[PDB]
Amino acid sequence: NEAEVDTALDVLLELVVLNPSAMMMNAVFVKGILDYLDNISPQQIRKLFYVLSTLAFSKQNEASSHIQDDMHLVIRKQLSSTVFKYKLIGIIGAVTMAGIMAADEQCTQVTSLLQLVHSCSEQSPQASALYYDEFANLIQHEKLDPKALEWVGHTICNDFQDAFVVDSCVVPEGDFPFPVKALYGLEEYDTQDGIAINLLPLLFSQDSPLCLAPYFRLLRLCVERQHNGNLEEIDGLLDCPIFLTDLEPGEKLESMSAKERSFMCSLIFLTLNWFREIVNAFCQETSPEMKGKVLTRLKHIVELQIILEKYLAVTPDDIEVFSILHCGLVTKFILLGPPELLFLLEDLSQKLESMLTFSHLQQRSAQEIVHCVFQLLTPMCNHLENIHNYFQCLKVQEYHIMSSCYQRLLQIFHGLFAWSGFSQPENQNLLYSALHVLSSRLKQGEHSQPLEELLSQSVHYLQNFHQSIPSFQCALYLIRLLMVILEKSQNKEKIASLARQFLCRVWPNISNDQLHALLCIYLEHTESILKAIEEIAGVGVPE
Amino acid sequence: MDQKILSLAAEKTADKLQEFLQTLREGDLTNLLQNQAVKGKVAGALLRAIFKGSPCSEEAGTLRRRKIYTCCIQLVESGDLQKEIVSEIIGLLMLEAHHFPGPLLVELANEFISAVREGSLVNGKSLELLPIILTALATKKENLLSGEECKKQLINTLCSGRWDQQYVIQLTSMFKDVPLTAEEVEFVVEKALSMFSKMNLQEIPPLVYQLLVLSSKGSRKSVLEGIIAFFSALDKQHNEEQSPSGELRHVEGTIILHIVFAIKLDYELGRELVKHLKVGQQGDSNNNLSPFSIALLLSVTRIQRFQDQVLDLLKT
Amino acid sequence: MQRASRLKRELHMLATEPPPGITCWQDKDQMDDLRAQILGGANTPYEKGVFKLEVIIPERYPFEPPQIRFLTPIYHPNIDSAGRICLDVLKLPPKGAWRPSLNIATVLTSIQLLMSEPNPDDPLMADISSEFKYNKPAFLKNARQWTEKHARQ
């Protein structure tokens, strides 16, 4: 199993970098693995090919080049195959193998190798994507001979600027049953420029553009490795409008659900992942105009995210970017918008759920995510929490959005507070500050207080949201949050009374799983479980 | 006349080259063979042209693609061309073999069966395509009888026909990479086992290794029953000859060790061995076990999981 | 150290009783390197040829084969113009066949032998190998002229 595999592999990596000469005798046994790549996942494959390749292209062990030829063999053979699973392995192997051999005929070897993988991988869309993803991963992780990167960058730039990038002429080419314009420009850019993107005509000619975002990532990272993070060649690209349908209404085109719906949902999905990759690109840049464009792009992302989650409702079946979350709410109904908040909080929840219980975030430590989020959630999402409490204390679509915003806010708080690094003492400094800001949300001045006092003030702040809660899930999240704070400290009665209150409300529905979790929250924490069950079984009858 | 196809490819696809096919018409043997003899770098480029030039959307591209294949199989084989060119040209013939309609690949595979009957397969580098074509036949589920049925009868004809005694092992190393069923792997390996008899001994061990790594997605009962029944017969004949020892001892051993390094990664291999070598009722133990079966077991006692099980059987 | 003993024996055995038509001496210019000579074989296009070789014995010799080049250009199916020899006994196994059972004398013998009988299956010059296979006369002529151009005095 996978951790055994991983650990062994790490051991092998350690042993080869430590003592090559000893394992080079028995590298033969390691060559004999290659029959049983049938039971290894892609990631392990990367390290495996790394080891064998650092064996062979260690400079004394090139007399024993048998390894080198045999893996060349399985490369081209495995790489060849029609079936994606096999093509996959060879793809990754080739890429990683190429990486390490390149640290003049070696440059011709990697050239031939990368050209043939690119040529073979052109035909399958999934594989083309994978190449660009994997080649990007390789160029980023490895510092490798800038001649080869100077070779690949001039290829990728040219192929990108002819493949996708077209003129910003206001009429696109294609007989479309849709008002196709150049939408989601910044409009601060010069609109009569050359650089635009042929997204929807490529998507209609499909029925290459699903590989668009990672291909841009690849181009950028060749450019980032060459010019050392100077993005003055590209910064005309976040200026571009994108050739799309008028997406903004998904209510005028309701109850005519065709393959048009699949087209539209996939179109918005690519547009947002495109925009996510632009934010991934230009996040490192400190220039204020660039950051302004990135904020405008987040507003474009977030409004299309509301249209996409709403399109999935009608049709059934980085972290430094949250430095923009310092922007406060401008709630459209009562008077960073509501769709801005739902998208950013949906993003941070979908990251933290995978990460703490995805390659860019996974190459960062979980401790790095928790440390940075403490500055980047609490003292500006408590503002958004307070505005949500103000709104819900007092038309339909913004209520449905801000209920879900409120759910997501409490979900990110629960993910933060349920972290298993806080029984461990080094993270208790973070917890003292975290409760010191939640205690300091109501009134300040009480500093260097005992832990239990900070816990009681934090839960006293978090408990009095209970009247404003619009939906059952936010209630359950609030009680699970109060439980994971109060277990640090008596409060059984509090959790029981609150669970009982939220079982006693009307709730205009409720899924069985949420109500199961709330009943086990009530009955376990009640003073007498027997008299609690006899209370529910002397009301279970007058139903 | 080589720099009047580089221009043709340098601009656009199937417009001038699909016609440039119908113009020349003579034979892509002089244009490769004699062109290769001087400079093969041309051939690695050239084929990129013809193939982009002869797209399979049209049948007069497809039969020009079906002939260039029948050519370059035969030239790499009979031809003492360099390794370096062959490592490319095959690379191409693999890389492009994916997108064919049904009845051309069965004919290419019939050429391959005809070659395994007769042809001087002086390198089975020619048969490096034979794995991926049975893949690309199976992915096209359309009636040409479907693709998988044609694959089944095709590998039945590979098994029924005589194997090149020289490179029988190299043919058996190809069914390693194809996905197969039980019946298919069983047919191919019981023929690879019929072939131990009609060989030198010193090449039986690596063949046994390439049988076991196949048997990992196939029959184990069969692989080890074959090795055991074979060496059982061998040692009995060595005994009644005594009533070729100094090497018969190297083989038995090297085999036990090669089956060790497999039962090491394949815990089910060991369990099937052990089940095969049960006493159960004492009448199975008076047809099962051997002077070779037991050296093999008493090597096996070194595996940590397996020591104990083994001994207990032997003792009882 | 196996180097020192091998060199001492082989040098003097090759200085006093070499194989016929073959010489091998400690290169005067490079007394770590060797100079080898193959005399043009009777009944071959290499007839009337003196073929100079640079014979470097790797430091791990005799556990590794010699690295030997023709200094004399030769027109041969299995030997390019730069002098590289396609022969298993100059590579470690499983591909090659080198072991300390063999030596400078027996491999210079295997070389003179290949010069007599080219093996077309390991072709360095595909043109020369196909001309050897189909047009013996043209090969023999170009090779004999090659002998009189490059292996002459």
Curated annotation (Swiss-Prot), chain A:
Glycyl lysine isopeptide (Lys-Gly) (interchain with G-Cter in ubiquitin) crosslink, residue number(s): 77
Subunit-level organization: Homodimer; cannot be ubiquitinated and does not bind DNA. Part of a FANCI-FANCD2 heterodimeric complex that binds and scans dsDNA for DNA damage. Interacts directly with FANCE and FANCI. Interacts with USP1 and MEN1. The ubiquitinated form specifically interacts with BRCA1 and BLM. Both the nonubiquitinated and the monoubiquitinated forms interact with BRCA2; this interaction is mediated by phosphorylated FANCG and the complex also includes XCCR3. The ubiquitinated form specifically interacts with MTMR15/FAN1 (via UBZ-type zinc finger), leading to recruit MTMR15/FAN1 to sites of DNA damage.
Organism, scientific name: Homo sapiens
Domain statement: The C-terminal 24 residues of isoform 2 are required for its function.
Protein name: Fanconi anemia group D2 protein
Taxon lineage: Eukaryota, Metazoa, Chordata, Craniata, Vertebrata
Disease: Fanconi anemia complementation group D2: A disorder affecting all bone marrow elements and resulting in anemia, leukopenia and thrombopenia. It is associated with cardiac, renal and limb malformations, dermal pigmentary changes, and a predisposition to the development of malignancies. At the cellular level it is associated with hypersensitivity to DNA-damaging agents, chromosomal instability (increased chromosome breakage) and defective DNA repair.
Subcellular location(s) per record: Nucleus
Expression sites by tissue: Highly expressed in germinal center cells of the spleen, tonsil, and reactive lymph nodes, and in the proliferating basal layer of squamous epithelium of tonsil, esophagus, oropharynx, larynx and cervix. Expressed in cytotrophoblastic cells of the placenta and exocrine cells of the pancreas (at protein level). Highly expressed in testis, where expression is restricted to maturing spermatocytes.
Record's function text: Required for maintenance of chromosomal stability. Promotes accurate and efficient pairing of homologs during meiosis. Involved in the repair of DNA double-strand breaks, both by homologous recombination and single-strand annealing. The FANCI-FANCD2 complex binds and scans double-stranded DNA (dsDNA) for DNA damage; this complex stalls at DNA junctions between double-stranded DNA and single-stranded DNA. May participate in S phase and G2 phase checkpoint activation upon DNA damage.
Assigned protein family: Belongs to the Fanconi anemia protein FANCD2 family.
Curated annotation (Swiss-Prot), chain C:
Organism superkingdom: Eukaryota
UniProt keywords, alphabetically: ATP-binding, Disease variant, DNA damage, DNA repair, Fanconi anemia, Isopeptide bond, Nucleotide-binding, Nucleus, Phosphoprotein, Transferase, Ubl conjugation, Ubl conjugation pathway
Effect of residue 86 to A: Loss of E2 enzyme activity
Shown residues in whole-protein numbering: 1 to 153 of 197
Catalytic reactions on record: S-ubiquitinyl-[E1 ubiquitin-activating enzyme]-L-cysteine + [E2 ubiquitin-conjugating enzyme]-L-cysteine = [E1 ubiquitin-activating enzyme]-L-cysteine + S-ubiquitinyl-[E2 ubiquitin-conjugating enzyme]-L-cysteine
Record's GO cellular component terms: nucleolus; nucleoplasm; nucleus
Protein name (record): Ubiquitin-conjugating enzyme E2 T
Pathway: Protein modification; protein ubiquitination
Family as reported in the entry's similarity comment: Belongs to the ubiquitin-conjugating enzyme family.
Residue(s) of cross-link: Glycyl lysine isopeptide (Lys-Gly) (interchain with G-Cter in ubiquitin): 91
Species annotation: Homo sapiens (Human)
Record domain UBC core: where: 2-152
GO MF annotation terms: ATP binding; chromatin binding; ubiquitin conjugating enzyme activity; ubiquitin protein ligase binding; ubiquitin-protein transferase activity
